[PDB]
Design an enzyme around this catalytic site. Structure first.
Site, PDB file in Angstrom:
ATOM      1  N   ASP A 135      -6.563  18.495 -15.358  1.00  0.00           N
ATOM      2  CA  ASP A 135      -7.145  17.351 -15.697  1.00  0.00           C
ATOM      3  C   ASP A 135      -6.900  17.233 -17.196  1.00  0.00           C
ATOM      4  O   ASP A 135      -7.367  17.728 -18.260  1.00  0.00           O
ATOM      5  CB  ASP A 135      -8.707  17.270 -15.440  1.00  0.00           C
ATOM      6  CG  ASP A 135      -9.090  15.687 -15.905  1.00  0.00           C
ATOM      7  OD1 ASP A 135      -8.651  14.868 -16.775  1.00  0.00           O
ATOM      8  OD2 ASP A 135     -10.117  15.340 -15.127  1.00  0.00           O
ATOM      9  N   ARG A 141       0.757  -1.422  -0.152  1.00  0.00           N
ATOM     10  CA  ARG A 141       0.113   0.234   0.212  1.00  0.00           C
ATOM     11  C   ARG A 141       0.824   1.497  -0.067  1.00  0.00           C
ATOM     12  O   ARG A 141       0.420   2.028  -0.735  1.00  0.00           O
ATOM     13  CB  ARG A 141      -0.890   0.146   1.103  1.00  0.00           C
ATOM     14  CG  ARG A 141      -1.447   1.498   1.432  1.00  0.00           C
ATOM     15  CD  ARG A 141      -2.884   1.306   2.331  1.00  0.00           C
ATOM     16  NE  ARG A 141      -2.710   0.700   3.527  1.00  0.00           N
ATOM     17  CZ  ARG A 141      -2.077   1.087   4.509  1.00  0.00           C
ATOM     18  NH1 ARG A 141      -1.412   2.141   4.596  1.00  0.00           N
ATOM     19  NH2 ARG A 141      -2.087   0.164   5.680  1.00  0.00           N
ATOM     20  N   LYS A 188      -8.722   6.005 -19.808  1.00  0.00           N
ATOM     21  CA  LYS A 188      -8.967   6.423 -21.362  1.00  0.00           C
ATOM     22  C   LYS A 188      -7.967   6.014 -22.196  1.00  0.00           C
ATOM     23  O   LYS A 188      -7.507   4.696 -22.315  1.00  0.00           O
ATOM     24  CB  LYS A 188      -9.575   7.811 -21.377  1.00  0.00           C
ATOM     25  CG  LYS A 188     -10.580   8.177 -20.174  1.00  0.00           C
ATOM     26  CD  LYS A 188     -11.724   7.687 -20.198  1.00  0.00           C
ATOM     27  CE  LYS A 188     -12.788   7.484 -18.863  1.00  0.00           C
ATOM     28  NZ  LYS A 188     -13.251   8.924 -18.673  1.00  0.00           N
ATOM     29  N   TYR A 242     -16.079  17.516 -15.722  1.00  0.00           N
ATOM     30  CA  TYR A 242     -16.585  16.074 -15.839  1.00  0.00           C
ATOM     31  C   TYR A 242     -17.665  15.861 -14.989  1.00  0.00           C
ATOM     32  O   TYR A 242     -17.449  16.140 -13.587  1.00  0.00           O
ATOM     33  CB  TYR A 242     -15.325  15.097 -15.760  1.00  0.00           C
ATOM     34  CG  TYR A 242     -15.835  13.667 -15.688  1.00  0.00           C
ATOM     35  CD1 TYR A 242     -16.394  13.057 -16.661  1.00  0.00           C
ATOM     36  CD2 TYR A 242     -15.381  13.183 -14.178  1.00  0.00           C
ATOM     37  CE1 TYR A 242     -16.881  11.522 -16.625  1.00  0.00           C
ATOM     38  CE2 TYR A 242     -15.800  11.749 -14.161  1.00  0.00           C
ATOM     39  CZ  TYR A 242     -16.455  11.097 -15.356  1.00  0.00           C
ATOM     40  OH  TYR A 242     -16.792   9.645 -15.009  1.00  0.00           O
TER      41      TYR A 242
END
Ligand SMILES: *Cc1c(COP(=O)(O)O)cnc(C)c1O
Ligand SMILES: *Cc1c(COP(=O)(O)O)cnc(C)c1O
Ligand SMILES: *Cc1c(COP(=O)(O)O)cnc(C)c1O
Ligand SMILES: *Cc1c(COP(=O)(O)O)cnc(C)c1O
Ligand code: NA
Ligand code: NA
Ligand code: NA
Ligand code: NA
Ligand code: NA
Ligand code: NA
Ligand code: NA
Ligand code: NA
Lengths: 380, 380, 380, 380
Positions: free
Chosen positions: D171, D47, D196, D99
């Protein structure tokens, strides 16, 4: 030290570089060389060697007390690699009830290449001695066998093979290295379909081979690298992972097997039961002498086909599927699923009756498995 | 329609059940049966068939305009499966400079099983006609070959094979189905080491076979299921994924190849250049007639071994490793890495000189690859 | 029926489409829609839902007797998702010795967002009643806790939480659903770091959350989909796979734990031992009443730091690493590895002495683990 | 040197230990320590850090010319991590058409924690200057935006953010680092939904963050380790693999985009077209100044809903699914799939008409994509 500890700590399954406590998955085909011929850790092309595959090879070599391990894309690819140690004109002895895929491979593929095959009843080892020809080079034994669990004396087969100059081979799939170690008894090569108990989770198709013989290992490595039936790195990783719980899984399976056999022998709807733990089973003392536990495969007779199908439909925890050695308990009808091309009369003669059921015991609760199967039998 | 579209939409690579736009990874060995023999979607045991492997098989069958695809654990396992279509006493013709692993397999494994091998210079196809014996059953062609990129006329080889009743086979690894489709030219079987261009990312070892012949497909399926050199599901998934960009990668590679060859031919430190795009190359017109692009493998001569090693050390973007078809450009010296067991005099006679360099062009920027290699050559 | 059977057959871990007996790995981000809004099986975007993740969610919901499962990219992501059920100004009660990462999250992240935190000694549940403010909305309990294994009464905490209108939460990591089921005792939400026992093999980082409350499940699903700490499909698959052997692994671990504790209590070089199975342990009867087995985490005191390090170096089968719940037995020194930022005097006051050792018992042979640790203690 | 070369050779994506030319998949949670606190290669708990995740983090840091990379379990987990740099009472400015998931996160999750949100039209940067409050700490920009591809001046936003002491965030999902590098223009933090274009194959859900600011990197690392939305190793590996072909894929996509836009603008059944390459598009010169290519997302107007659905049904190569950036070309109707909770009148006012179609161009053949879409439009 003890077996459950050896499963966790035997072999090389950590990363020396980062310290990762599990084997990295080398999803890679090739390797940087610092200079021509200078390999950093000995790797140059994954078909020849891959570090994840090497990890699983070292596990199987350790668990079988061998020196060399080999991982193949399936059990039958392991068997094919071993059979390719022979040449045209060579002759191999196998037990008569060997696995159907082994039979198919030898009699439909390798006989076209001039390998000669003789099937003998190895439950009496002098059968082997009678079948030995001047051209015999290999002795190939499964014990116990499928689906009637016939037992062959491993140590006497090893002695016969040494005496007559034969490569001895044991398919140790049903017992696993947790309970039976053929290399400790003089056998040259041990192999497994790791698709079954070793992977343990019904999610890898794989074969594993171990030997202590340097020159046989050299020949196997050459065959592996030239015919290329190698296990991939992701499947090697899942194999290493599944083997960790082999001891726990086999002991659970054995507890359920003992109780299920008591139930089957007491039930009115069940005739013969086949399993090496039954004291009246042929070569029971031989099995006890070469193994210290039991396979989870049991076969037993009900009346007929309709009873067998009713059994399958009435059970809640026995799943109808092929293979064995899952965490789920599996059920099947050999006469319909593995022996259906044999004529019915020969099937009956060999013991594959229409009501012969084979179960592969999983790791569900013992009482649930016994109760479920008994209540299904009660509906007959 | 067009090739780049066919790479994306050809074959079955979605999930009918959930609609997932990529092929699920069926990390599984066996399948529930609703009734004995009743399979939900035709699957019963992953060695026999696995839905992820079926996805990649349908991609290769589509891309080569065949009807049946087969996925093996490596290129040489594909070749071994195809060679096992023959029996002892059968004879196979191969081109003389076939891939070293194919050579090794045929002359060190399958000759022990009575397969007879003849190597001929197939750049003149009448050589094939001279070598045909009454026992010849297979004609096996690589074009272009490694490392000198000799070109063989595929359509004439197919005609010869039909005339004399031979199974014709083309190893189409170097060209990929993006540029060359042997089944469209009458060949019976096409195969690939998908370890190279098809996977494209140096992270899968795999072989692929396609055919349009129903009965050869039946025999291949039987051999695959009995000798078991199957590709695993994770590697099948990574293959399907890598094939999506095959068109883009091959076109980038071809742009760089053209520019690199102009540079190599102009440079004083470089003697002969081997590549089918050079108009003076043997059978250049044959290649142009059967393919519509070029492999990314180029070989060229520098002075000697020391020049070759200096070239490797001076390049920034050419990586010293085995294999070809990566996204990285790779460099190697055949005389030291693939032909080092051949005596030096025979090496020199066959063209494998001590300064023969082989590069596999990747997808880096064309100008960077040309400039890097030229500035390295300038240091000689 | 029984627990070992429920581990194998509970939840949805087969493929309805092909019958595959294991959950397919949907390595996919999006899904074909037949018409706008018409989803074949309810999937449209993997962050929102993925069929492999749904499989592991259904397993954890079944094993904890809940109705809704949620799989997160780690245990602390599960905890963060649950804490985001609150708003600024809300107040949460936790046990004083909660896991260090939970402490860090609440006091270094969520206090900057106006969440108020009170740590109380929940071994006496009236402590909770004293700490309840008008703004308290959540009660968060670990039992048993790390590293001193303090036990909190789950059923009384649930009653207090219902009485005062609080969301009750239990971190059930140390006990697993095999031995302790907080939702059966009235708790609203149960969570796990599946990185530990549930995965079981030291190869997945993951968190799991289960609830029976429809509206809390709706809020958790909204938070998961908007803050996006989702477990990936490969890790979900490995989790489902590891959970199959949870029962076998926990029972082996418990056998070794009992024997190791007898040894530790008899040894002269060992002072206090912390574990809920010891009858003199605080709330031992409470633990026995809410659980039917034991965690594999044990803490015990040796003399000082040098003794602790000598212990680590002298053991053959106890591995120095972080985490717990592996198949390997793990060893660590809290004062140096998890509490080293606490001043030494406060460490000593809370019981974290310099010679406090924590072991996580694995599945090696019981006698090997007892003997190895005893012979290491003998060197002090 | 050049971008296509940097994609192949930038970052650390080989194994230093074995030389493997691809990043090993460290499917592991924890790491052996040689002594307490002594880490072999700096790893102690996955982690906190995992070597496969570190490989993908180094790739994104290199491609964006940053110094620190961070890999999260999804794009919205990356956004949530960045937003958690703020405290209650802090205020963030975002572009008005950000978004939908970002909107949802800020206005439905983080406002409950006292984060204040203002949406402004950033196509005129003085809007930002008007919206700045004394409590504003962050400026968060998408350019170009979804689905109308509004362009925001990155370099002026960076200057405004520096002047007023704000953390600036871009972004950069739609453009990828292949065409637009916000950190080179003064932005503090750049992030991506790697779900994406970066992954490129519709098979990983992931987010990526890069920065050059040591102290912001320290805060991001702390948040990642405490809230735990980490990307897993298999998904990190598939991301690294997909990024290799990013340059090739984006250039193919851009060729098709140019041709498709010529077709759309000429067609009678198409009204407005939205894309930053159109010279009449707002801030076209700004886009050309900060990017050197184009996103593959195009929006255009047909008559009404029925025309939009007919378009979807008539296309052969445009797939109806969510997400964008696949190798397949994707088609969708925002008013029905992403904006259907907005009242129709407000939808129409913002430009989301009932016949607004959004396509995400894939890597199929340019002529096939143009012809397929044109022949579908002809049926209106
Ligand atoms: C226990 C153990 C052994 C013991 O091997 P045997 O020959 O069966 O006694 C071997 N290797 C390792 C790593 C072990 O832990
Ligand atoms: C374009 C396309 C074809 C065309 O095949 P050819 O024989 O090469 O013309 C076939 N299948 C699919 C799915 C295609 O998209
Ligand atoms: C045995 C079993 C159960 C039993 O659940 P309990 O509430 O613990 O009794 C539930 N589901 C399945 C699938 C089982 O096999
Ligand atoms: C080409 C290359 C670069 C160039 O970086 P820029 O700042 O874009 O010029 C950096 N790193 C590597 C590894 C490269 O190959
Ligand atoms: Na083989
Ligand atoms: Na021996
Ligand atoms: Na083969
Ligand atoms: Na034909
Ligand atoms: Na979370
Ligand atoms: Na309840
Ligand atoms: Na996050
Ligand atoms: Na800066």
């Amino acid at each position: 030290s003890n077996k459950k500890t050896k499963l966790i700590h035997g072999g090389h399954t950590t990363d020396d570089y980062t310290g990762a406590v599990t084997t990295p998955i080398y999803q890679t085909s090739t390797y940087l060389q610092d200079d021509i011929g200078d390999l950093r850790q000995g790797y140059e092309y994954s078909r020849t060697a891959n570090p994840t595959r090497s990890s699983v090879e070292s596990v199987i070599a350790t668990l079988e007390n061998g020196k060399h391990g080999f991982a193949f894309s399936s059990g039958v690819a392991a068997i094919s690699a071993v059979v390719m140690l022979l040449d045209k004109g060579d002759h191999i002895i196998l037990n008569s009830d060997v696995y159907g895929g082994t039979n198919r491979a030898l009699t439909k593929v390798f006989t076209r290449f001039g390998i000669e095959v003789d099937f003998v009843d190895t439950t009496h080892t002098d059968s082997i001695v009678q079948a030995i020809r001047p051209t015999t080079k290999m002795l190939f034994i499964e014990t116990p066998s499928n689906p009637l669990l016939r037992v062959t004396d491993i140590k006497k087969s090893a002695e016969i093979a040494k005496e007559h100059g034969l490569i001895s081979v044991v398919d140790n799939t049903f017992m696993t290295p947790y309970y039976q170690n053929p290399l400790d008894l003089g056998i040259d090569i041990v192999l497994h379909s790791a698709t079954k108990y070793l992977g343990g989770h019904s999610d890898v198709v794989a074969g594993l081979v171990a030997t202590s013989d340097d020159k046989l290992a050299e020949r196997l490595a050459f065959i592996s690298n030239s015919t290329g039936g190698i296990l991939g790195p992701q499947d090697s990783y899942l194999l290493v992972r599944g083997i960790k719980t082999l001891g726990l899984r086999m002991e659970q399976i054995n507890r359920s097997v003992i109780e299920i056999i008591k139930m089957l022998q007491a039930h009115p709807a069940v005739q013969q039961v086949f399993h090496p733990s039954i004291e009246s089973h042929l070569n029971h003392d031989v099995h006890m002498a070469q193994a210290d536990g039991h396979t989870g495969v049991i076969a037993f007779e009900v009346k007929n086909t309709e009873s067998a199908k009713q059994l399958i439909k009435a059970t809640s925890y026995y799943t109808l599927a092929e293979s064995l050695g899952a965490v789920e308990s599996l059920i099947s009808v050999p006469a319909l699923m593995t022996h259906a091309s044999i004529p019915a009369d020969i099937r009956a003669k060999e013991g594959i009756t229409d009501g012969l059921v084979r179960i592969s015991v999983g790791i569900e609760d013992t009482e649930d498995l016994v109760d479920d199967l008994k209540q299904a039998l009660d509906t007959l």
